[PDB]
Amino acid sequence: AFLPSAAYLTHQQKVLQLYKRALRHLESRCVHRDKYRYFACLLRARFDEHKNEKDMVKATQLLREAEKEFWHGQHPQPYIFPESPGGTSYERYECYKVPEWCLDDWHPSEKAMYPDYFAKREQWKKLRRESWEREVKQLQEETPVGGPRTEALPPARKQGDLPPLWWHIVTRPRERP
Amino acid sequence: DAPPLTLEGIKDRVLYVLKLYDKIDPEKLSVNSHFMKDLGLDSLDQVEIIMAMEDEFGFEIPDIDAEKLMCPQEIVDYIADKKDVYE
Amino acid sequence: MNLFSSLTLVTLILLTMPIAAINFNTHKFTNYPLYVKTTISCAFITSMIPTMMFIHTGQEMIISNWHWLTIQTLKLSLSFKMDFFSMMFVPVALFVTWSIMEFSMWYMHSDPNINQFFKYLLLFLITMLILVTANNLFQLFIGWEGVGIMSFLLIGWWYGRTDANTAALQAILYNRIGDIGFILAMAWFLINLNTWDLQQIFMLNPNDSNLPLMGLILAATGKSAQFGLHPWLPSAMEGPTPVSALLHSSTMVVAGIFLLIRFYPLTENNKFGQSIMLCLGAMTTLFTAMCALTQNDIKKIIAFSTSSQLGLMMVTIGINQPHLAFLHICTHAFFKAMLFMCSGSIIHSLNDEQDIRKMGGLFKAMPFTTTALIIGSLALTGMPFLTGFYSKDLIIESANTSYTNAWALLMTLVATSFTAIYSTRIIFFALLGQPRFPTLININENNPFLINSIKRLLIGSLFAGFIISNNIPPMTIPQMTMPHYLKMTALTVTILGFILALEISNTTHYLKFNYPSNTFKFSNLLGYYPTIMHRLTPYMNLTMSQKSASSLLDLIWLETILPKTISLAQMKMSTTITSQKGLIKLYFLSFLITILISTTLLNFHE
Amino acid sequence: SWDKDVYPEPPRRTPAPSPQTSLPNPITYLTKAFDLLVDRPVTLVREFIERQHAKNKYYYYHREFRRVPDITECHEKDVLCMFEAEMQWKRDYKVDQEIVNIIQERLKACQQREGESHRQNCAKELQQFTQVVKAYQDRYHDLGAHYSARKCLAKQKQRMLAERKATKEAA
Amino acid sequence: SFPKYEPSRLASLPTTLDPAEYDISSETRKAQAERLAIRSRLKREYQLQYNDPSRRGVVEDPALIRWTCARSANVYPNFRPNTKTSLLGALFGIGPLIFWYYVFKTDRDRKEKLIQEGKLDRTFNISY
Amino acid sequence: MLKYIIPTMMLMPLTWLSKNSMIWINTTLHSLLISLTSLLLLNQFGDNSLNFSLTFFSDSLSTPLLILTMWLLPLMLMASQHHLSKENLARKKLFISMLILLQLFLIMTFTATELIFFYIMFEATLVPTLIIITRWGNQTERLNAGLYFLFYTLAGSLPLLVALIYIQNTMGSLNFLILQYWVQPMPNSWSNTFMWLACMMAFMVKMPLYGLHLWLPKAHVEAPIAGSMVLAAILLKLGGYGMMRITLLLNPITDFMAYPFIMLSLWGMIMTSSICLRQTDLKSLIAYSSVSHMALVIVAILIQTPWSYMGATALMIAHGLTSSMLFCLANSNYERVHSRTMILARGLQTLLPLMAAWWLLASLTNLALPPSINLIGELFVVMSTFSWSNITIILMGLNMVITALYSLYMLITTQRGKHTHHINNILPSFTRENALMSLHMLPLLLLSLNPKIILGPLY
Amino acid sequence: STFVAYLPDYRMQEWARREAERLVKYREAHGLPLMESNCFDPSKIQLPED
Ligand SMILES: CCCCCCCCCCCCCCCCCC(=O)OC[C@H](COP(=O)([O-])OCC[N+](C)(C)C)OC(=O)CCCCCCCCCCCCCCCCC
Ligand SMILES: CCCCCCCCCCCCCCCCCC(=O)OC[C@H](COP(=O)([O-])OCC[N+](C)(C)C)OC(=O)CCCCCCCCCCCCCCCCC
Numbered sequence A: 001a002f003l004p005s006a007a008y009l010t011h012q013q014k015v016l017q018l019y020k021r022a023l024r025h026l027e028s029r030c031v032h033r034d035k036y037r038y039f040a041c042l043l044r045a046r047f048d049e050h051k052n053e054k055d056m057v058k059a060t061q062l063l064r065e066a067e068k069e070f071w072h073g074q075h076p077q078p079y080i081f082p083e084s085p086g087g088t089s090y091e092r093y094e095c096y097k098v099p100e101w102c103l104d105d106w107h108p109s110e111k112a113m114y115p116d117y118f119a120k121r122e123q124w125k126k127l128r129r130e131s132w133e134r135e136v137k138q139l140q141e142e143t144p145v146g147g148p149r150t151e152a153l154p155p156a157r158k159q160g161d162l163p164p165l166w167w168h169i170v171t172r173p174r175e176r177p
Numbered sequence B: 001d002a003p004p005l006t007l008e009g010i011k012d013r014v015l016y017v018l019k020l021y022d023k024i025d026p027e028k029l030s031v032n033s034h035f036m037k038d039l040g041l042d043s044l045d046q047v048e049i050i051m052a053m054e055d056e057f058g059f060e061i062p063d064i065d066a067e068k069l070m071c072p073q074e075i076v077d078y079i080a081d082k083k084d085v086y087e
Numbered sequence C: 001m002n003l004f005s006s007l008t009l010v011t012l013i014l015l016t017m018p019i020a021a022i023n024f025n026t027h028k029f030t031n032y033p034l035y036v037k038t039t040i041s042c043a044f045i046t047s048m049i050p051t052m053m054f055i056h057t058g059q060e061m062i063i064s065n066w067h068w069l070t071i072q073t074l075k076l077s078l079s080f081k082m083d084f085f086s087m088m089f090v091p092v093a094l095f096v097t098w099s100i101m102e103f104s105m106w107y108m109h110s111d112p113n114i115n116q117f118f119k120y121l122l123l124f125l126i127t128m129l130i131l132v133t134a135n136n137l138f139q140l141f142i143g144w145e146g147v148g149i150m151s152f153l154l155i156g157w158w159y160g161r162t163d164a165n166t167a168a169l170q171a172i173l174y175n176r177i178g179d180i181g182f183i184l185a186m187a188w189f190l191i192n193l194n195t196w197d198l199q200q201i202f203m204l205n206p207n208d209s210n211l212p213l214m215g216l217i218l219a220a221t222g223k224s225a226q227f228g229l230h231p232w233l234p235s236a237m238e239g240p241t242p243v244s245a246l247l248h249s250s251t252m253v254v255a256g257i258f259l260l261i262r263f264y265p266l267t268e269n270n271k272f273g274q275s276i277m278l279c280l281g282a283m284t285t286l287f288t289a290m291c292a293l294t295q296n297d298i299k300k301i302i303a304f305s306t307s308s309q310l311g312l313m314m315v316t317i318g319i320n321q322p323h324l325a326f327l328h329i330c331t332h333a334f335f336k337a338m339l340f341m342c343s344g345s346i347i348h349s350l351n352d353e354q355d356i357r358k359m360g361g362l363f364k365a366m367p368f369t370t371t372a373l374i375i376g377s378l379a380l381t382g383m384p385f386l387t388g389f390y391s392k393d394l395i396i397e398s399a400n401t402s403y404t405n406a407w408a409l410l411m412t413l414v415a416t417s418f419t420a421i422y423s424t425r426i427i428f429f430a431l432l433g434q435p436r437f438p439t440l441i442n443i444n445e446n447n448p449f450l451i452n453s454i455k456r457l458l459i460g461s462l463f464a465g466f467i468i469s470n471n472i473p474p475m476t477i478p479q480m481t482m483p484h485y486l487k488m489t490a491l492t493v494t495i496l497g498f499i500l501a502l503e504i505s506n507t508t509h510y511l512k513f514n515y516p517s518n519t520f521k522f523s524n525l526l527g528y529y530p531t532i533m534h535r536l537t538p539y540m541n542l543t544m545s546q547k548s549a550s551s552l553l554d555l556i557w558l559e560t561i562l563p564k565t566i567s568l569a570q571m572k573m574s575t576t577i578t579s580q581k582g583l584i585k586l587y588f589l590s591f592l593i594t595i596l597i598s599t600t601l602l603n604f605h606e
Numbered sequence D: 001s002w003d004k005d006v007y008p009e010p011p012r013r014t015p016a017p018s019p020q021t022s023l024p025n026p027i028t029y030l031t032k033a034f035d036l037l038v039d040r041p042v043t044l045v046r047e048f049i050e051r052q053h054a055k056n057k058y059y060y061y062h063r064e065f066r067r068v069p070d071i072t073e074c075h076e077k078d079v080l081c082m083f084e085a086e087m088q089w090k091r092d093y094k095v096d097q098e099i100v101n102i103i104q105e106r107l108k109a110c111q112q113r114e115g116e117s118h119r120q121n122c123a124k125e126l127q128q129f130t131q132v133v134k135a136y137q138d139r140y141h142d143l144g145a146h147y148s149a150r151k152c153l154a155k156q157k158q159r160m161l162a163e164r165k166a167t168k169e170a171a
Numbered sequence E: 001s002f003p004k005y006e007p008s009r010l011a012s013l014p015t016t017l018d019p020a021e022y023d024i025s026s027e028t029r030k031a032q033a034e035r036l037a038i039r040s041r042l043k044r045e046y047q048l049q050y051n052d053p054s055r056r057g058v059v060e061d062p063a064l065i066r067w068t069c070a071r072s073a074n075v076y077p078n079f080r081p082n083t084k085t086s087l088l089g090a091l092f093g094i095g096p097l098i099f100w101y102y103v104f105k106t107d108r109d110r111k112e113k114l115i116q117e118g119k120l121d122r123t124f125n126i127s128y
Numbered sequence F: 001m002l003k004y005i006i007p008t009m010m011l012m013p014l015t016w017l018s019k020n021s022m023i024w025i026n027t028t029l030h031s032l033l034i035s036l037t038s039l040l041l042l043n044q045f046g047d048n049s050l051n052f053s054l055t056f057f058s059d060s061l062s063t064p065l066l067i068l069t070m071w072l073l074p075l076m077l078m079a080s081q082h083h084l085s086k087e088n089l090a091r092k093k094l095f096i097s098m099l100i101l102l103q104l105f106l107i108m109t110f111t112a113t114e115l116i117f118f119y120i121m122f123e124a125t126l127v128p129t130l131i132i133i134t135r136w137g138n139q140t141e142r143l144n145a146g147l148y149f150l151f152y153t154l155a156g157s158l159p160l161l162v163a164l165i166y167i168q169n170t171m172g173s174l175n176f177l178i179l180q181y182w183v184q185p186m187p188n189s190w191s192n193t194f195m196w197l198a199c200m201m202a203f204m205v206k207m208p209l210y211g212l213h214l215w216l217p218k219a220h221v222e223a224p225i226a227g228s229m230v231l232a233a234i235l236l237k238l239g240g241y242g243m244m245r246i247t248l249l250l251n252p253i254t255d256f257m258a259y260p261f262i263m264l265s266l267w268g269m270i271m272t273s274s275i276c277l278r279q280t281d282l283k284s285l286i287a288y289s290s291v292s293h294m295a296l297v298i299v300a301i302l303i304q305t306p307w308s309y310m311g312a313t314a315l316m317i318a319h320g321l322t323s324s325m326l327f328c329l330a331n332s333n334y335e336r337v338h339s340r341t342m343i344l345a346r347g348l349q350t351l352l353p354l355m356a357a358w359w360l361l362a363s364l365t366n367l368a369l370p371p372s373i374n375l376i377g378e379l380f381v382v383m384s385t386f387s388w389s390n391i392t393i394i395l396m397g398l399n400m401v402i403t404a405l406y407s408l409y410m411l412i413t414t415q416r417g418k419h420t421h422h423i424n425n426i427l428p429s430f431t432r433e434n435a436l437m438s439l440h441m442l443p444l445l446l447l448s449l450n451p452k453i454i455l456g457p458l459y
Numbered sequence G: 001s002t003f004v005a006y007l008p009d010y011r012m013q014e015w016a017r018r019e020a021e022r023l024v025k026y027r028e029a030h031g032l033p034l035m036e037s038n039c040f041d042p043s044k045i046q047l048p049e050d
C-alpha cells in the first residue's frame, strides 16, 4: 500500500498482517485471558494448516477468502491502544511539542537563566552548520541518476561526519514534554 | 504516575517475557540471539512475540517496524527510541 | 430581607473575584487552584444561608438592581430571582464543583496550564449561576451562550488533538440548533406578550401558546441532548475527566430541563406540549440505554447513562411533575459526578486506559473507589433509601398512576431495566474477575485530594436525597394510593435487569464463540445515527457550499450576467467603430448617406 | 424615597414567630451578627457621608415645557409651527412610553408580591395594563420608523372615519 | 456465504477486499515502482530544503499554490455556457429566490388580510 | 462641524512638515487627540437633533459613525506603518495624506444636511480608496479590483444623482430638515417605481446587495491593511446611512417595492455564509462574512420598523469594529508567513498564545456572543423580521448556525492543531500588534456597558 | 469612558420617567383615564364629509 522503502507488500507480509489483525480482533471478542488463549491456539492451528502450500493461485485465493472471513467477523469497535491512532490519548501532547527553533527568539534576559544549556545549544548549532555541506556532498554523489528509487537515506561512510539529514530527527521533541 | 524507564529495566523485562515463552529454551537465549536462525522460530512466532511485547509495554509497534525486530537488542533499541529514555 | 439579598449578591461577587485576581496578576500565582477551591467553599457556605432562610419561611425575592436599557416600552434590568429552584440548585452546584476542583487539583497536577484550566472551570460556574438565577430571557440567553462557549473551550482542552476539535465543534452545532429554538421562543414572547421578564409572562398567561412551547422544547432538546440532537453528549468525552464530571454530568446538561422547569405555568395548561415532551423523553431514555448496553469505553457508558437520566427527567416533566423533575436533578448531580470521579481515578491508575476490557481485579486493589462506585451504581439504579430512591421511584409511581401514553410508560420501564443492566455490567467488568491490565503496576489512590472529594460526594450520595426531600415544601399532591403491582414496578424491574445482566456476564465467561448479530451491531454502533448523519449532512452542506454557491453562482454566473457581458459588448462595439480603412472617399460617401437619410427618412428640414 | 401613590404597595403583614421546638434557629443568631458586624459600620459610614453632604446644599430642577399649539392648528408646509408641534408630539410620545413602563412595573410587582394567589389578587393591575396598552396601541402603533405627528393625525382620522361609519351602519 | 460488502459514496471499499490489490503482474509492479520513485524524489527535494541550517522562512509548496489558483482563478477561463451550466444556474440561482418570494408573499397577504378584519389577536402587541 | 474639519485639514501640514522619522508619531498623536475631541457630539436631545449650521447637522444616527471614523484613523496609522517601512518618504507622506483626506470626506459625509452635498462627499470618497488600493496593494489584480469597485459604484450612483436633482426640482429643497416636514406620499406608478430604483440602487451596490457584491472579495482582498480596514469599517456603512436618510421620501411605495431585495438578501446571507464555509483564503472569508452581515442590515432597513432601525445601526457599528479587528489579525499572519492561504500556517496557539486569545475574542464577537453589541443588533433585527413574517426565524436560525460554524472553522484551522513543520520564521508578537488588537477590542467590550449611545435616533 | 458614564441625561430618558410619574399621579388622583385612544382632540378635527 503506502510504504517508504518498498513499492509493494509481499504475500508473506499480507499473511502476517492478517494474522495480527485477526488475533487482535479475536482478543477483542474474547475479553478473558484463558478464553482468548484457547481461541488463539485454534486460530494458530488454522493458520498452520495451510502453511505449506506451493500453489500461488491457491494461496492467493486462501488469502482472499481469509480476508472476507475476517471482514464478516470483525469487532464493531476493537481494542485500540491509548497512544495508537484512533486511541483516546492519540496526539494528545501535540499542543506541548514546541519546536526547538523557538529558542532563538528568546530575550537575552530570560536566556541568562540557563547559561550552560544555551552554551550547549550553541555548540550543537555549530556542529550542525559545520556538517551540513559535507552531508549534502555525500548525498549528492550517492543518489543514482534519475532520482532516488526509495526513501531510505545512507549512513555516514567515513569517520568524523554525521549521517545526512539528521537534525530534525535527532532534535525532535520528547513524547512527554 | 508514569515511572521512568532505563535500558537495564527494558532489557530485563523483555528477557523476562521472552523467557516465559515455552518455545524458547531459557538457558540458550541472550540479548542478541536471532529468531529464525539462532532459535529456530517461524514468522508467526515472531508476530506472536511482537504482540506479547506490545502487551507487556502497553504501546503498539507498527507492522512496518515489527517485521524488522529480529533479536532482543533491536526490540530494546526500538522501545528506547520510541519512549526517549536516557535523557 | 437585608441579609437575604446581601448574601446572594455577595455569593455571586465572591465567585467572580478570582477571575479579576488572575487577570491582574504579574508573577506566578502561589497555589492559585487552592485559592479558587477556598473561594468556592466560602461561596457555598454564603449561598447556603439564604436557602436556610427560604426553608424556614418560604421567602422568595426578586432583585432588579441595575437598570441596563430601555427599548421603547421594553425595559431590561439586571434582575436576579431567588425562588425555590435557585436556592435548591445553587448550593448543590457549588458543592459538586468544590469536589470537582479538589479532584482537579489531584488529576491535572502535571498539566503546565493548570491555572487556565481552573479559570475556565470558574468561568463555566459563573455563567451557569447567571443562567439559573436569571429573571428575563436576555440574561437567560447570556448564561445559555456562556455555558455553550465554555463547553467548547473545555472539550477541546488538548487543542493539538483533532478529535477534540471535532467534538467541540459538533457540540457547538447542536447547541446552536437549540439556540434557534430559544430565539424563536423569545421572539414570540416579545411580539405577542410585550415582555421578556418572566413575571409578566406568567401574569398574562396565553392560551394559544403552542409555538413558544415548541421553541422551548427544541432548545431543551439541543441543550439536554434529547433524541435527534443527542450524539454531542457522548462525543464530548474527549475532554479531561473533571470537565466531563462537572459539565456533561451534573451542571451544564441539565440546563434544558431547568429551562422547561422554569416555564411550568405555561406547560401545565397545554396537553400537546406535555405529550410531545413525554414522547421525546421516553424515546431518549430507551434509545440511549440500549446504546449503553454494549459499550466498552467507561466514560462513554457514563455519558449514555446521564443522557438516559435526562430522558427520564423529560418524561417526568411530560407527566406534569416538574418539582419531581427538579428533585431528580438535585439527586442525580451527586452520584453522577462521583461516578465520573471514580472512573477518572481508575483511568489515572492504569496509565490513561479507558477500556473496561483492560480492567478487572480492582475490588481489592483500590478499595475506596470500589466502595464509592458500588454505592453510586446502587444509588443510580434506585436502591431503597439511598439518594436516588427519593426521586426516581416517585417519578415511576407518578408515571404509572396517571393519564399517560402507554408506549412512553413501557419504554420508561424497559429503560429502567437497562440502567440496572449496564450498571452491573460496569461493576462486573471493572472490578470483578482477574486482572487484564498491563504487567507493571503503579496502582495508587493515596492522595488526600482525591479521597476527600470522593468522600464528600459519597456522603452527599448517601444522605442528600433524604435531607432535600424532607426539607422542600409540598408544591403538589403526592399520589400514594395505588395497587400492589404498580408500587413494586420499579424495584421488580431493576431486580430483573440485575438478574438478566448477571446471567449475561456468566454466559460471557464461558468458552464459546458466536458471530455477532444485527442487534449487537445496532446497539454497539450507536444505532447508526452518527455514522449516517455526520457523514451525510456535512457532505451535502459542503458540496452545496462549493459546487453551487462558491463556484457556479458567484464565480461563474453572477460574474457572467452583469460585468462580463457588458464588457464584451463594449469591446465588440469599439472594434466595429474603430475599424475604418482611412479613405476619404468612404467618409464622404457616409456623409452623403447621412444627408440623404436626414432629409428624406427623418424629415429634419420640416 | 419615592412617591407611594404612583407606585402603590399594600401594607406589610408579617406573622409573629412561634418557636414550637426547642432547637435554636441559626437565622436569629445570623441576624444578630449581621446587625452587629455589617449594619452598624455601614450606617456609621453613611452618617458621615450625609454629614459631609449637608455642609453644602444645591438643587436641581425638573424641566417644565409650556404647551404650544399642536399639528391640528398648523398650516401645511409652515416649518416653524409644524416644528414646534412635532417637538411637542415627540415629547408626549416619550412620556407615554414611560407611562406604559410604569404600569408594566406595577403588574410585575403585583405578580411577584401576591405569590401563588396572583391570578385572583392582581385583577386591577391586569385591567389597568390592558386599558393602557389598548390606548397606546390605538395611539402609536403601525407608524413605522419614520413616525411623525402627521402620520398619527392621519391614523386617528382614519380610525374616526371607521368609527363614524360603524355607528352609521348600526343606526 | 458471507454478505458481500457493497461500497457507497460515503463508505469506500476496504483495501483488503479489493480484487486489484492482489495483482502480481509486472505492469502493476512497474507502476508501483514509478510512483515510489516520484514520491521519493519529491521527498528528497523537500528534505533538502527542510534541513538547511541557513534557511529561515517558508519552504514554498508549488502544489498548494497550484491548488489555490485552480480553486480561485481558473473557474471563469475554463467555463463554457452550455445546457448543463445554464440549467444548474437557473435551478440554484432563481429557484430558491422565487420559492421564498412566493412563501413570504402568501404569508404576509394572509396576515394583512386577517389584521384588517380584526380576526388576528393583537392585544398586547405594541412592539414592532 | 468646523471644529473637527479644521484639525483634520491641519493634519496635512503636520505630516508634510515633520521629520523623516517622526511622521508616524506626530500623525498618530494628533489624530488620537482629535478622536478624544470627537466625544462632544454626544449632546443629543430626545426631541431635536444637534443642528449646527445651514450645511451641517448631526443626529443620533450619524454620531456613532463619526466617532467610529475619527477613532479608526489612528488605528490605520498604527497598522499601515510596518509594510511601508522601506518606502520612499514622499510616498509615505502621500499615503498618510490620502488617509487624512479620506477621513475629512467621511466626516463631511455623515453631517451633510443637504442631500446633494451628501452625494458629492459620498462619491468624493471613491478617489482616495481607489488610489490606495491600486497603488499600495501587493498583487497583480489590484488594478482589476479597482476597476470593478469604481465602475460598480459609479454605475449604481449616476441614477441617484439624476433622481436627487429631480427631487430638488419637484419639491424645491434637498435640505433634510425641510424634507421631514414637506414630505409627500409617493403613489404607485412606473415613474415612481424607477424613482425608487434610482434612489436605492447606489446604496444597494455600496452596502452590498447579494448579486451586486462581486466587487467586494476583490477590493477587500487586494487592498493594503489600512485600505481593508477603512473599506470594511466605514465605507460599507455609507450605503446604510443613505438608505436610512432616503427612505423618508419613498413612502408608501417601499412596502411592495422592497420584496425582491428582501428575498435577495434573506437568501443571500445563506449563500455567502456557505461560501465562507469553503474558503481557502482568509481575507476572502472575512470579506464574505462582511457581505452576510450587510445583507442583515439591508433587510433591517427595508422592513422599516423602530426595532429594525436600532438593530441596524448597532449591527453596523459592531460589524465595523469586528471586521477591522479580523482584517488586522489576518494581516499580522500575512506579515509572518507571506501568504494568505488558510491551510498553510496552522497551530499558531503553541507559538503565539496572546494572539490566539485575540483571535478567540474576535471570533466570539463575530458569532454574536451576548451581551456584545453584535448580539444586540442581530437580536433586534431578528425580532423585527419575526414581526414581519414568521419563516424569517427559520432563515435567521440557519444563518446563525452557519455563522458560528465558519467563525469556529476559522479559529480551529488557524490557531489549533499541529503546527507547520517547515515554517520557522514565526516571530513573537510585537507590542504594536498587541496594542492594535487591544484598541480594537476594549471599546467593543466597553460599549456593552452603555449600549444606548449606538442605538440610532429613535432609541 | 468617564465622559460617556456621566453624560447629562442622554436623550431625555430620565426626564421622561419623571414627567411620566408626575402625569400618572395627577391622572390617578382625579379618576382620569391614564391614556386616551386619540392623541388629538376630536373636537378640533374636521372629518371629510361622506
Ligand atoms: C475596585 C475598587 C473600586 C472602588 C471601591 C470603593 C467604592 C465601592 C463602591 C461603594 C458604593 C458606591 C455607591 C453605590 C454604587 C453606585 C450606585 C448608583 O447609583 O449606581 C448608578 C447606577 C445604578 O442604576 P440606575 O438605575 O441608577 O441607573 C442606570 C443607568 N441608566 C439609567 C443610564 C441606564 O449604575 C450602577 O450601579 C452601575 C454598576 C452596576 C453593577 C453591575 C454591572 C454589571 C455589568 C454587566 C454588563 C452586561 C449586562 C447584560 C445584561 C443586562 C440585563 C439584561
Ligand atoms: C450597478 C448596476 C445597476 C444600476 C441600476 C441603477 C438603477 C436602475 C434604474 C435607473 C433608471 C434611470 C434613472 C431614473 C430616474 C428617475 C427619476 C424620475 O423622476 O423618474 C420619474 C420619471 C417620470 O418622467 P417625468 O417625471 O419627467 O414626468 C412627470 C411625471 N409623469 C410621467 C406623471 C408625467 O421617469 C422617467 O423619466 C423615466 C424613468 C425610467 C428610465 C428608464 C431608462 C433607464 C433604464 C435603466 C438603466 C440602468 C443603468 C444601466 C447601465 C448599467 C451599467 C452599464
Ligand SMILES: CCCCCCCCCCCCCCCCCC(=O)OC[C@H](COP(=O)([O-])OCC[N+](C)(C)C)OC(=O)CCCCCCCCCCCCCCCCC
Residues within 6 Å of the ligand: C016, C019, C067, C123, C126, F063, F064, F065, F067, F068, F071, F317, F443, F446, F447, F448, F449, F450, F453, F454, G001, G002, G003, G004, G005, G006, G007
Ligand atoms: C460610541 C460610538 C462609536 C463606537 C466606537 C468608539 C471608539 C472610541 C472609544 C472612546 C471611549 C469609549 C466610549 C464608550 C465607553 C463605554 C463604557 C462606558 O462609559 O460605560 C458607562 C457606564 C455607565 O453606567 P450607568 O449608566 O449604569 O451609570 C449610571 C450613571 N451615573 C454614573 C451618572 C450614575 O459605566 C458602567 O456601566 C460602569 C459600571 C461600573 C464598572 C463595571 C462593574 C462590573 C464589571 C464586571 C464585574 C464582573 C461581572 C462578571 C464577569 C464574569 C467573567 C466575564
Ligand SMILES: CCCCCCCCCCCCCCCCCC(=O)OC[C@H](COP(=O)(O)OCCN)OC(=O)CCCCCCCCCCCCCCCCC
Residues within 6 Å of the ligand: C163, C166, C167, C169, C170, C171, C173, C177, C180, C217, C218, C221, C227, C228, C229, C280, C530, C533, C534, C535, C537, C538, C541, C542, F394, F397, F398, F401, F405
Ligand atoms: C425535537 C425536534 C428534534 C429534531 C431532530 C431532527 C432535526 C435535526 C437533525 C440533525 C441535524 C444535525 C446533525 C447532522 C450534522 C452533524 C454535523 C457534525 O457535527 O458532525 C460531526 C462530525 C465529526 O464527528 P464524527 O464524524 O462523529 O467523528 C468521529 C471521529 N472522526 O463533524 C463534521 O463532520 C464537521 C462538519 C462541519 C460542517 C457541517 C455542515 C452541516 C451543518 C448542518 C446544519 C443544519 C441546520 C438546520 C437548521 C434548521 C432550522 C429550521
